[PDB]
Amino acid sequence: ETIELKRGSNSVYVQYDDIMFFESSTKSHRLIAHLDNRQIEFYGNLKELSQLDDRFFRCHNSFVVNRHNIESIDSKERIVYFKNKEHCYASVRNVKKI
């Protein structure tokens, strides 16, 4: 369950469940892997990442979440909470499918 996060000159290798979620941001050309203790930018695409494993799920245009690290979901406000206290958002379309 190892994923290579290509950073540029170097890669970081982490386990699937080290990842809370992946984020696309308009402020970077790189995606952001939200790990338990820090964020790491890397080159990738959300669609491909969602296909690596059933636990990964595209819940928003900007986010692919790791279901194994979800603590709770507020379906009304569409907020997804992770074990490390980070959150992301879910679209109306996908919130109930997470």
Sorted by sequence, the CB contacts under 8 Å of residue 65 that are 6+ apart come out as 20, 21, 22, 56, 57, 59, 80, 82, 88, 98
* Domain ranges (residues) in the chain: 1-98
Among 36, 15, 34, 92, residue whose Cα is nearest residue 60: 92
Backbone dihedral region of 33: left (phi > 0), alpha (psi from -120 to 50 degrees) or beta? beta
SS3 content of the chain, % helix, strand, coil (to 5): 15, 45, 40
- CA 78/CA 61 separation, integer angstroms: 13
Topology (CATH level 3) of domain 1-98: OB fold (Dihydrolipoamide Acetyltransferase, E2P) (2.40.50)
Encoding tokens for residue 90? 């879910």
Strand partners, 95: none
- CA 25/CA 53 separation, integer angstroms: 22
Encoding tokens for residue 12? 């970081």
Among 46, 30, 39, residue whose Cα is nearest residue 84: 39
